[PDB]
């Protein structure tokens, strides 16, 4: 399936999505540091095989 | 295969720090070893530090 | 032999708004240079002062941008505001406001008048408006501190900086630009081995010279208590 640019990211708190807009992309002017999400993207996977 | 691309542009101000290579126009390269406090630098009769 | 003559602050020759000459007299043999270098090293590193630490320019989001009608980039305006010399009376943080419209230089004399804030160089140019319909409006946060605190030390200390558009300025808080000292011979009544110490002092205008000498000598005397006690 297609990868999706989104602000709805699993295993990531609301604090790490603080400077992303509703499209999952960082705001212009945002002071970011290493590890901050700039563009939120999720890849569809399957068969986790727990 | 590509559905979309998001290019983010980061502007990073890099201050000078020990390990940065500095040079003159006469082949006198070198690496900053220490950043010395102003009252530790050598100074002339008028108090102007180097 | 076991008793020393102690110096006293004899003279303050205020050469300029930002340049002074303090005389300490009389000094025993060798104490001119002891006190001179201790006071120079403290005056040059440890004096408190107010510096611009944050600016909110009205329409801008980051400093790598340009305002329309202003001749300078926002980064150059912030570098001009970094060198703004303010003395704040009775506070440790103030927010100044600068609104200015029309063609001309936006100087420090255009910052709106706070009662407990004194701009010591009102001719200090902040920007140039090059358009008659252009206007600039900023909220400049002046803060009292000591030494040099870069904004890098201050970004991710929490500071509740939810607003994008609040730009941090590196804060050089020290009001002292240059200390020189000279040990001359004093003209005391009986003795000839007595010195005097002249401290030439360039500042940004925002600290009194005698007050800075008092403050540096107080810092010395408080650091010497651990040795006077020595337990």
From Swiss-Prot, chain B:
The source's domain of life comes to Bacteria
Per the record, the similarity remark reads: Belongs to the RNA polymerase beta chain family.
The entry's function note states: DNA-dependent RNA polymerase catalyzes the transcription of DNA into RNA using the four ribonucleoside triphosphates as substrates.
Subunit structure comment from the entry: The RNAP catalytic core consists of 2 alpha, 1 beta, 1 beta' and 1 omega subunit. When a sigma factor is associated with the core the holoenzyme is formed, which can initiate transcription.
> Per its record, how is this protein called by name?
DNA-directed RNA polymerase subunit beta
From which organism does this entry originate? Answer: Escherichia coli O45:K1 (strain S88 / ExPEC)
Gene symbol here is rpoB
Which residues of the parent chain are present?
1045 to 1094 of 1342
Swiss-Prot record, chain C:
| Catalytic reaction annotation | RNA(n) + a ribonucleoside 5'-triphosphate = RNA(n+1) + diphosphate
Q: Where is this region: Alpha N-terminal domain (alpha-NTD)?
A: 1-231
**Which enzyme class, named as a word?**
transferase
Q: Kindly state a single biological-process term from the GO annotations of this entry.
A: DNA-templated transcription
Q: Which UniProt keyword terms apply here?
A: DNA-directed RNA polymerase, Nucleotidyltransferase, Transcription, Transferase
Highest taxon listed in the record's lineage = Bacteria
Its EC number is 2.7.7.6
This entry's Gene Ontology molecular function terms read: DNA binding; DNA-directed RNA polymerase activity; protein dimerization activity
What is one cellular component GO term in this UniProt entry? cytoplasm
Q: What does UniProt say about this protein's domains?
A: The N-terminal domain is essential for RNAP assembly and basal transcription, whereas the C-terminal domain is involved in interaction with transcriptional regulators and with upstream promoter elements.
Tell me how this protein assembles: Homodimer. The RNAP catalytic core consists of 2 alpha, 1 beta, 1 beta' and 1 omega subunit. When a sigma factor is associated with the core the holoenzyme is formed, which can initiate transcription.
Q: Which family does it belong to?
A: Belongs to the RNA polymerase alpha chain family.
Q: What does this protein do?
A: DNA-dependent RNA polymerase catalyzes the transcription of DNA into RNA using the four ribonucleoside triphosphates as substrates.
Protein name from the UniProt record: DNA-directed RNA polymerase subunit alpha
Tell me what organism the protein belongs to. Answer: Escherichia coli O157:H7
């Amino acid at each position: 399936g297609p990868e999706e640019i989104t602000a709805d990211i699993p295993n990531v708190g609301e604090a790490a999505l603080s400077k992303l807009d509703e499209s999952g992309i960082v705001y212009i002017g945002a002071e970011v540091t290493g590890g901050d999400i700039l563009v939120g993207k999720v890849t569809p996977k399957g068969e986790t095989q727990l | 295969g590509v559905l979309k691309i998001v290019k983010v542009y980061l502007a990073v101000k890099r201050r000078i720090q020990p390990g940065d290579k500095m040079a003159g126009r006469h082949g006198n390269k070198g690496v900053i070893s220490k950043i010395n406090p102003i009252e530790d630098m050598p100074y002339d009769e008028n108090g102007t530090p180097v | 032999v076991t008793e020393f003559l102690k110096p006293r602050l004899v003279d303050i020759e205020q050469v300029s708004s930002t340049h002074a000459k303090v005389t300490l007299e009389p000094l025993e043999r060798g104490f001119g240079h002891t006190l001179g270098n201790a006071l120079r090293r403290i005056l040059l590193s440890s004096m408190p002062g107010c510096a611009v630490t944050e600016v909110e320019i009205d329409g801008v989001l980051h400093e790598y941008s340009t305002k329309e009608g202003v001749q300078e980039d926002i980064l150059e305006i912030l570098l001009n505001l970094k060198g703004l010399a303010v003395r704040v009376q009775g506070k440790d943080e103030v927010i100044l406001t600068l609104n200015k419209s029309g063609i001309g230089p936006v100087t420090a004399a255009d910052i709106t008048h706070d009662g407990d804030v004194e701009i010591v160089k009102p001719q200090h140019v902040i920007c140039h408006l090059t358009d008659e319909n252009a206007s600039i409006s900023m909220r400049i946060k002046v803060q009292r501190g000591r030494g040099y605190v870069p904004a890098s030390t201050r970004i991710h200390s929490e500071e509740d900086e939810r607003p994008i558009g609040r730009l941090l300025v590196d804060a050089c808080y020290s009001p002292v630009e240059r200390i020189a000292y000279n040990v001359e011979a004093a003209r005391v009544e009986q003795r000839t081995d007595l010195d005097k110490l002249v401290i030439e002092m360039e500042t940004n205008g925002t600290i009194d010279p005698e007050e800075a000498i008092r403050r540096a000598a107080t810092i010395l005397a408080e650091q010497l208590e651990a040795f006077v006690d020595l337990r």
